[PDB]
Amino acid sequence: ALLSFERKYRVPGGTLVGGNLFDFWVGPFYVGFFGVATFFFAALGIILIAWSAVLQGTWNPQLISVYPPALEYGLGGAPLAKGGLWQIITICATGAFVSWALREVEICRKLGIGYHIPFAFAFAILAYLTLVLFRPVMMGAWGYAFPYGIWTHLDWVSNTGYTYGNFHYNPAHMIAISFFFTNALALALHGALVLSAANPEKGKEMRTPDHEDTFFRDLVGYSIGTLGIHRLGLLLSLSAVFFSALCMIITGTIWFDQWVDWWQWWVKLPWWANIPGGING
Amino acid sequence: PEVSEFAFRLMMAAVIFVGVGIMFAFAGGHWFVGLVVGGLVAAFFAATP
Amino acid sequence: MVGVTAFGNFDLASLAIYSFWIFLAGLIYYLQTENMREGYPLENEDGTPAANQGPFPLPKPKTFILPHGRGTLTVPGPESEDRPIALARTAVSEGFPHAPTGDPMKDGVGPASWVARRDLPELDGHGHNKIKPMKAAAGFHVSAGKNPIGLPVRGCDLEIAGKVVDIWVDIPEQMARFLEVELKDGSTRLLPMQMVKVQSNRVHVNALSSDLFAGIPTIKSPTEVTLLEEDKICGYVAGGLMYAAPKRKSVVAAMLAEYA
Amino acid sequence: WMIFDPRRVFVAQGVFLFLLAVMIHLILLSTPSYNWLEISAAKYNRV
Amino acid sequence: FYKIWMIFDPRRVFVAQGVFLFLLAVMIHLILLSTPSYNWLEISAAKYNRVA
Amino acid sequence: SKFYKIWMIFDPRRVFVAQGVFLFLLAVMIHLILLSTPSYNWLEISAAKYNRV
Amino acid sequence: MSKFYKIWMIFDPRRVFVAQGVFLFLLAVMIHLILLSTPSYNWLEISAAKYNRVA
Amino acid sequence: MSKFYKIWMIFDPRRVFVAQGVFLFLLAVMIHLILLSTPSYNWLEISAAKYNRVA
Amino acid sequence: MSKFYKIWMIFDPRRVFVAQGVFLFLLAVMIHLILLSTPSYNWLEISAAKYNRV
Amino acid sequence: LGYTGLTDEQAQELHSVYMSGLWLFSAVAIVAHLAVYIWRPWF
Amino acid sequence: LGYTGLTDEQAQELHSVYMSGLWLFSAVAIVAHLAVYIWRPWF
Amino acid sequence: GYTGLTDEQAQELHSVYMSGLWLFSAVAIVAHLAVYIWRPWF
Amino acid sequence: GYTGLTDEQAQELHSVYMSGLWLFSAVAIVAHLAVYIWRPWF
Amino acid sequence: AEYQNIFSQVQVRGPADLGMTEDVNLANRSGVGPFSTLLGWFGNAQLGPIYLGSLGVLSLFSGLMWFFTIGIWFWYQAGWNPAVFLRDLFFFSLEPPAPEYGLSFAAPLKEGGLWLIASFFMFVAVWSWWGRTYLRAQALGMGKHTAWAFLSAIWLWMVLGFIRPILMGSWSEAVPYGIFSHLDWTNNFSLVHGNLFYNPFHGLSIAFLYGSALLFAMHGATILAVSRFGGERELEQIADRGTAAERAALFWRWTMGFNATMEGIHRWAIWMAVLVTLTGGIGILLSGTVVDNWYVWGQNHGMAPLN
Ligand code: BCL
Ligand SMILES: CC[C@H]1c2cc3[nH]c4c(c3C)C(=O)[C@H](C(=O)OC)c4c3nc(cc4[nH]c(cc(n2)[C@@H]1C)c(C(C)=O)c4C)[C@@H](C)[C@@H]3CCC(=O)OC/C=C(\C)CCC[C@H](C)CCC[C@H](C)CCCC(C)C
Ligand SMILES: COC(C)(C)C/C=C/C(C)=C/C=C/C(C)=C/C=C/C(C)=C/C=C/C=C(C)/C=C/C=C(\C)CC/C=C(\C)CCC=C(C)C
Ligand SMILES: COC(C)(C)C/C=C/C(C)=C/C=C/C(C)=C/C=C/C(C)=C/C=C/C=C(C)/C=C/C=C(\C)CC/C=C(\C)CCC=C(C)C
Ligand SMILES: COC(C)(C)C/C=C/C(C)=C/C=C/C(C)=C/C=C/C(C)=C/C=C/C=C(C)/C=C/C=C(\C)CC/C=C(\C)CCC=C(C)C
Ligand SMILES: COC(C)(C)C/C=C/C(C)=C/C=C/C(C)=C/C=C/C(C)=C/C=C\C=C(C)\C=C\C=C(/C)CC/C=C(\C)CCC=C(C)C
Ligand SMILES: [Fe+2]
């Protein structure tokens, strides 16, 4: 149940809460206090999603949907069959995510590595809380959050996007999309480059980081370096999530019209607004 | 309480950006000029702390 | 072919989605088997092979031809620690921590662990040493940022433990890797650049207290550092984070220990 | 002065004083009252 | 008042002063042009009946 | 006057490249401004003068 | 004007020639496309109207 | 053509030949596509109308 | 034309042959596709109309 | 010269073989164009 | 002079072959343009 | 001399380059005269 | 000197540069005069 | 706070690295460019040298011509006015031919022909760049993984611009050139085919794009966490497994029950990124050709409530 090198790393300590009360492993998983919390919240959320499937009347996993309370309920509680289950599952999900991050903190402390992984997960948790907690609270209703269904939260995304015309024109959305695309491109390039260095042409020696830098300089004239590429990947993903959270937190709170109407400000600058010709003239 | 040269420089750059942006947006006919001037000043100040 | 179904609602789109589910299952199998090339077969907490080995079997071995005539590496293959592990079982049942028998930072266990790698320097593409002191690196110099050479080195206990004498740089990457620090006794240790915070006046090392700086493993050659020495130094410094905690003078830690 | 770096203190003080002065001037210009340019134009029949 | 040069780098202060002076001059000129009054271009245009 | 010593400060290669790029960009911008205006658009002027429409 | 040859002592002839070739081709393409865009001087459309190529 | 041969003293023949081939192919395709774009000189449509290939 | 063989003294035959093959295939596909795309010279549709397949 | 290391005799032989292949290809293309022009002229 | 390493004789021979090819290409292009202009003038 | 070529080499290169430039300008002037005769733009 | 050129070298470089600038200015002035005759803008 | 290794706290600069010479023709490689202190704070400061080969020259010429064609069309749409050009830069568009022309190349130059010219230039540029990636890998003896990942990206690009317009029998199906114009094309493509969200392959493409973001966040965070053990030198960890690779593997094993290797994580990375464009190309190819309304298709396949 242990890797060939895991034995020397399984030592007491690093726990945030509980000392040695939960300082143990179940199979490969390290439990800890926050692991106990994460498992409880996850099991409760999954069982409540199954129960909401029972209440809804469908067992098809793609049709299972846990809708938030309707806008009539505001930010208060709702009956479980009509929005309260969504609130409980949201609380369970937030608890599970935060417990997962803190369990990762405990594992980082035990292994003596930096806290970059829980810190990066905190960004995803913040984007989730923007979608389910911060934005609905700012707008004043839990019905502005998305349902917990495989294809119904896509309906939420579609309706929220088309509320503001074409959502492509949200500028923070544009920045987040560019970050996402660049992150996917950089991940493809990085995986491919490391694999090409480590799996060269058959019968040839394994390559070195010098070969990787030479390849990318001969390709695009610049090489960011191994440390550089890993920093870039982390920053691209985190910036994408940060700007998506920003785009959703400004939408419906400080912006209410179509976003192309936002883009009209550049067109109507005084020195070229009235010039005929072009597209907006 | 442990701010270094870069951190304090960036905080002051942000304050200068916001202030100059508001000031020039009020001065100019649009907020674009203020935003651009404030951003450029902040970037120049933070480039060489 | 809009609406052309072979049977039921199964059309070209359904064919594509099911074939992709099959392909994704196969790809996950392939990726997991590729990931199973290190750390396997699984072992018990005593060392013997475990009864459970996982649903995914071991992949057929593959050989890497190491550069610069460093031999070959076949994975998966017979791998052992090749070092005594100073840990004692804290419970007969599996899944519990192993307590260090002596000083874990000296024993190299826990967060202070290190791996018995090749006792040879890491080489660049041309065959020269990858990491070299900046004095022995032709033309290398500090280009930007605060120069750490000459600054005092402060431990986690807020006590000066030496001064920075030289910077060890990675010649291909052209980035600093290790700071050479002279202690009070005149000997020199290495500190990973990722574990030191170069401030305006001093270099702060939150991982190690001052008295632990002497315990850092030394390099057998003043001009080159091997992979084994790098691993030992990095393991010692990082394990200082969890094992020099009593000596660390953090205010939040002091307040928490006040109520704990 | 002992706790804080003199350069940072002076930079912050100067920036804050300039920002406050320009903010007060702009507040005066915005409001119809105490707006010197507008009252000067009205008095001399500029507009 | 000369001791302020004992604490601050003269080159940085001079560069910042030049940028600040140019920014303030541009701001004042833009404020003057913003209002219909004192906008010397518009004032000259209306005075000489440019728009005919 | 003694302007030649400006080359003791400015690298001739970078200065010449920047000057060439700037001159070409400025000339193209001015020509495009002239083309944009209905007057000085010599193609349109010749079309109207010789009845090319 | 007699000392213009000295420009080759500052600029590498290969880079200058490559840049000049690219520049001249781009300029010629730009001018030709400007002429094509205008209804006048669009020599293809002019010849079509002159010889009644309209179908 | 007095002393143009000296250009080969400056430019590698392989690079120049590759660049010239790429340039000529791209230019030829561009011109043919421009001709196909214009309703006149679109030889396929010209032949279609000439022999009444479209009903 | 008698001195053209000297191009092989300059150009590597492997890369020249590969580039020529790729270019010729791409050009042939391009021209056949252009012919197919036009209502005339679409030999399939021409044969369909001629023999009244439709 | 001598970038590829080929000799004048070898280069001339290779050029002869290449030109033979080119003439075969061009002959087939010319036959094809004659057949298409007879079937459907484009001029 | 030394950028390419060719001699004056080699450069002259290369330029002669290149100009022969260029003149052949230009002759074919001129014939093509004459044929197009006769078939459909563009002026 | 950043390029490094001698003055004689620079002189010869400039002579050849200016010859090519004058040939190019002669062709351009002939073309412009032909276009102006065909369709003047002034 | 950031470039390291001698006084005579820099002087010669600037002399030929100014010759080029004066030629460019002369051509620009001729073009502007031709345009102003053809279509004045004042 | 401690040093998070996000930005280098000190820069060292030495001789410019000219790169390896496995089988690369050094004549075609340019000289080293300037060192950027700003870039050095994050990665390598060295710019260049770049390899300018035959395929590199072809790709650069074709891409320059594509960019210049789009720019000249934009200048025409601006009335040659620099102010209008800057005002409406994102609103200009080089639209494909109208549907009446089908796939024919007879569309007028200002009504679709220029789009065809620009598309030919882009096609040649992209494919020559793919050949360039393949040959740059081949000259150094490295594997062709970059070539195949780029081939996945090219597959999506070809489906969007070439294959799907051919299967639909109209160039009007292709993507216009322009910022907001191609955004509008994306939106209209979703609307016409009935809520592309219900495309299962679009859903998979989004799953793998989110997985790419998640996996690059995880991998960058892991390598930055273990960089104190020299974890950034990943090829070394593949050849000689240090404590960095072991600590990363144990972190992920204790967190989620399974881990990767220092090499296998990059297989995960390349496949997670490749499947984005692979599933995306398949989903776009199916739209219109096989499924004309994805919401009705989802209803018939139990993905939507009604039916
Ligand atoms: C209203 C809009 C519609 C919609 C319509 C579409 C359409 C239409 C498409 C997508 C596609 C995608 N969509 Mg969707 N999409 C919507 C909502 C979403 C949401 C969301 C949260 O709501 C998300 C996350 C996504 C996510 C995604 C991606 C997974 C996918 C694109 C992959 C990619 O990288 O493409 C971008 C990458 C490329 C196009 C590859 C480019 C490769 C070439 C080689 C690059 C050449 C570069 C060129 C030469 C320039 C060089 C510059 C120089 C180097 C300087 N969509 C809604 C429902 N979406 C695509 C897809 O595959 O769908 C199945 C697609 O075509
Ligand atoms: C910030 C950059 C990206 C990021 C980063 C990131 N995510 C991370 C990490 C990091 C660095 C981890 O360390 C951690 C991890 O361990 O990954 C393997 C995690 C993680 N990222 C995850 C997924 C994930 N990340 C996503 C996104 C991203 N993660 C960002 C793009 C997405 C999407 C949609 O984009 C998903 C699905 C998990 C694999 C893992 C967190 C595991 C976890 O929290 O487990 C406990 C929770 C459960 C087991 C869920 C069931 C129990 C819950 C109580 C019920 C929740 C129901 C849910 C609300 C229903 C939603 C249904 C949908 C159809 C609507
Ligand atoms: C918004 O405001 C509006 C637009 C309404 C009105 C504008 C208002 C404002 C704020 C305007 C601002 C104006 C300003 C600040 C103008 C400043 C002008 C300056 C500073 C001009 C200076 C010019 C100097 C020149 C051109 C010097 C040229 C020098 C040479 C040609 C010779 C150089 C060569 C040398 C020194 C040789 C080198 C010597 C040695 C020994 C090496
Ligand atoms: C859009 O524009 C359209 C398409 C409408 C119009 C098209 C325009 C354009 C740009 C058209 C382009 C036309 C061109 C440039 C065509 C070029 C054709 C050529 C050059 C064809 C060459 C063919 C040659 C062949 C097939 C040669 C074959 C050779 C062999 C089979 C033998 C090779 C083997 C050898 C030499 C072995 C000997 C080896 C040793 C060692 C002696
Ligand atoms: C938008 O604008 C439109 C498209 C409307 C109008 C277009 C305007 C423009 C900008 C047009 C541009 C035209 C230009 C610049 C055309 C240039 C044409 C040239 C310079 C063509 C040169 C062709 C040369 C050829 C075909 C040479 C062939 C040579 C050979 C076959 C022999 C090669 C073998 C050798 C040299 C043997 C090697 C020798 C030794 C001693 C080893
Ligand atoms: C101002 O300075 C100047 C004018 C000099 C330069 C400025 C240039 C500017 C302003 C450039 C602007 C460029 C922009 C905005 C480009 C936008 C591109 C976008 C957003 C593209 C998006 C999608 C494109 C796709 C999917 C393209 C797909 C194309 C293909 C798959 C190739 C299709 C190939 C075809 C049709 C070949 C047909 C031809 C033949 C001969 C068979
Ligand atoms: Fe990596």
Tab-separated table of N, CA, C and O in Angstrom, chain C residues 151-188:
chain	number	residue	atom	x	y	z
C	151	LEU	N	26.117	40.047	1.940
C	151	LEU	CA	25.055	40.272	2.905
C	151	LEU	C	25.110	39.240	4.028
C	151	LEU	O	25.480	38.086	3.804
C	152	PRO	N	24.759	39.636	5.249
C	152	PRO	CA	24.643	38.656	6.330
C	152	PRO	C	23.440	37.752	6.126
C	152	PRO	O	22.431	38.141	5.533
C	153	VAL	N	23.553	36.532	6.639
C	153	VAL	CA	22.514	35.516	6.522
C	153	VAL	C	21.888	35.334	7.893
C	153	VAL	O	22.575	34.970	8.854
C	154	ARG	N	20.584	35.572	7.985
C	154	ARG	CA	19.854	35.485	9.239
C	154	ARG	C	18.990	34.234	9.242
C	154	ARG	O	18.257	33.979	8.282
C	155	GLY	N	19.076	33.459	10.320
C	155	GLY	CA	18.276	32.263	10.460
C	155	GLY	C	16.864	32.565	10.919
C	155	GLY	O	16.460	33.713	11.097
C	156	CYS	N	16.093	31.493	11.113
C	156	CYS	CA	14.715	31.652	11.559
C	156	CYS	C	14.628	32.132	13.001
C	156	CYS	O	13.568	32.611	13.417
C	157	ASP	N	15.707	32.016	13.768
C	157	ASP	CA	15.760	32.519	15.132
C	157	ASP	C	16.255	33.956	15.204
C	157	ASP	O	16.592	34.428	16.295
C	158	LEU	N	16.312	34.652	14.067
C	158	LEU	CA	16.743	36.048	13.999
C	158	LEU	C	18.166	36.224	14.525
C	158	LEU	O	18.469	37.176	15.245
C	159	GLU	N	19.047	35.296	14.160
C	159	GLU	CA	20.457	35.362	14.518
C	159	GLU	C	21.294	35.144	13.268
C	159	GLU	O	21.013	34.234	12.483
C	160	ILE	N	22.322	35.972	13.090
C	160	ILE	CA	23.155	35.891	11.896
C	160	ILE	C	24.027	34.646	11.976
C	160	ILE	O	24.675	34.385	12.997
C	161	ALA	N	24.044	33.866	10.895
C	161	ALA	CA	24.759	32.600	10.858
C	161	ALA	C	25.921	32.586	9.875
C	161	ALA	O	26.601	31.562	9.759
C	162	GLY	N	26.165	33.679	9.168
C	162	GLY	CA	27.258	33.731	8.221
C	162	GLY	C	27.045	34.866	7.240
C	162	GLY	O	26.198	35.733	7.441
C	163	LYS	N	27.832	34.837	6.169
C	163	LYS	CA	27.693	35.826	5.111
C	163	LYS	C	27.793	35.139	3.759
C	163	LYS	O	28.470	34.122	3.612
C	164	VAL	N	27.118	35.708	2.768
C	164	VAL	CA	27.145	35.152	1.421
C	164	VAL	C	28.476	35.500	0.771
C	164	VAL	O	28.870	36.670	0.721
C	165	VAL	N	29.170	34.484	0.270
C	165	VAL	CA	30.464	34.656	-0.366
C	165	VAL	C	30.365	34.551	-1.882
C	165	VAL	O	31.003	35.324	-2.600
C	166	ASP	N	29.571	33.612	-2.387
C	166	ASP	CA	29.506	33.375	-3.820
C	166	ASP	C	28.114	32.892	-4.192
C	166	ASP	O	27.327	32.476	-3.339
C	167	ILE	N	27.818	32.960	-5.485
C	167	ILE	CA	26.561	32.488	-6.047
C	167	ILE	C	26.874	31.352	-7.006
C	167	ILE	O	27.763	31.478	-7.854
C	168	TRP	N	26.156	30.245	-6.867
C	168	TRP	CA	26.282	29.116	-7.776
C	168	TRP	C	25.188	29.227	-8.827
C	168	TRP	O	24.001	29.269	-8.489
C	169	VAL	N	25.585	29.278	-10.092
C	169	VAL	CA	24.669	29.544	-11.187
C	169	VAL	C	24.575	28.321	-12.085
C	169	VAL	O	25.522	27.535	-12.221
C	170	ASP	N	23.404	28.165	-12.695
C	170	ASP	CA	23.146	27.137	-13.694
C	170	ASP	C	23.516	27.716	-15.054
C	170	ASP	O	22.868	28.650	-15.533
C	171	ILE	N	24.566	27.172	-15.673
C	171	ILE	CA	25.124	27.798	-16.872
C	171	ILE	C	24.129	27.837	-18.030
C	171	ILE	O	23.969	28.907	-18.637
C	172	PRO	N	23.450	26.742	-18.394
C	172	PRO	CA	22.444	26.862	-19.468
C	172	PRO	C	21.275	27.761	-19.101
C	172	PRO	O	20.946	28.686	-19.855
C	173	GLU	N	20.636	27.515	-17.957
C	173	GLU	CA	19.484	28.314	-17.559
C	173	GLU	C	19.854	29.754	-17.233
C	173	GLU	O	18.989	30.633	-17.316
C	174	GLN	N	21.111	30.013	-16.870
C	174	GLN	CA	21.573	31.347	-16.484
C	174	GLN	C	20.726	31.922	-15.351
C	174	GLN	O	20.297	33.076	-15.386
C	175	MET	N	20.476	31.099	-14.338
C	175	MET	CA	19.798	31.542	-13.132
C	175	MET	C	20.526	31.006	-11.912
C	175	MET	O	21.126	29.928	-11.948
C	176	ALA	N	20.475	31.777	-10.830
C	176	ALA	CA	21.143	31.388	-9.597
C	176	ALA	C	20.451	30.185	-8.972
C	176	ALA	O	19.221	30.142	-8.876
C	177	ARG	N	21.244	29.208	-8.541
C	177	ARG	CA	20.732	28.021	-7.873
C	177	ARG	C	21.067	27.992	-6.391
C	177	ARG	O	20.175	27.805	-5.559
C	178	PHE	N	22.335	28.176	-6.038
C	178	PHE	CA	22.782	28.067	-4.659
C	178	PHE	C	23.569	29.302	-4.260
C	178	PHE	O	24.367	29.825	-5.042
C	179	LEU	N	23.338	29.761	-3.036
C	179	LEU	CA	24.180	30.754	-2.389
C	179	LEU	C	25.185	30.038	-1.504
C	179	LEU	O	24.803	29.218	-0.664
C	180	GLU	N	26.463	30.336	-1.699
C	180	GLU	CA	27.491	29.829	-0.806
C	180	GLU	C	27.595	30.757	0.395
C	180	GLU	O	27.760	31.968	0.241
C	181	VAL	N	27.471	30.191	1.591
C	181	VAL	CA	27.426	30.959	2.827
C	181	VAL	C	28.576	30.508	3.712
C	181	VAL	O	28.693	29.318	4.026
C	182	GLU	N	29.418	31.454	4.115
C	182	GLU	CA	30.480	31.188	5.070
C	182	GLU	C	29.938	31.363	6.481
C	182	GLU	O	29.322	32.388	6.794
C	183	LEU	N	30.163	30.359	7.320
C	183	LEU	CA	29.659	30.355	8.682
C	183	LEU	C	30.677	31.017	9.610
C	183	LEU	O	31.662	31.612	9.166
C	184	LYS	N	30.444	30.918	10.920
C	184	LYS	CA	31.357	31.530	11.878
C	184	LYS	C	32.681	30.783	11.958
C	184	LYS	O	33.704	31.377	12.315
C	185	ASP	N	32.686	29.494	11.630
C	185	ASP	CA	33.880	28.670	11.743
C	185	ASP	C	34.761	28.712	10.500
C	185	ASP	O	35.793	28.035	10.468
C	186	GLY	N	34.380	29.478	9.480
C	186	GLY	CA	35.163	29.605	8.273
C	186	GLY	C	34.796	28.642	7.165
C	186	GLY	O	35.171	28.876	6.012
C	187	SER	N	34.078	27.567	7.477
C	187	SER	CA	33.624	26.643	6.453
C	187	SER	C	32.425	27.224	5.711
C	187	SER	O	31.752	28.144	6.184
C	188	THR	N	32.161	26.672	4.532
C	188	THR	CA	31.113	27.168	3.653
C	188	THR	C	30.066	26.091	3.415
C	188	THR	O	30.397	24.920	3.208
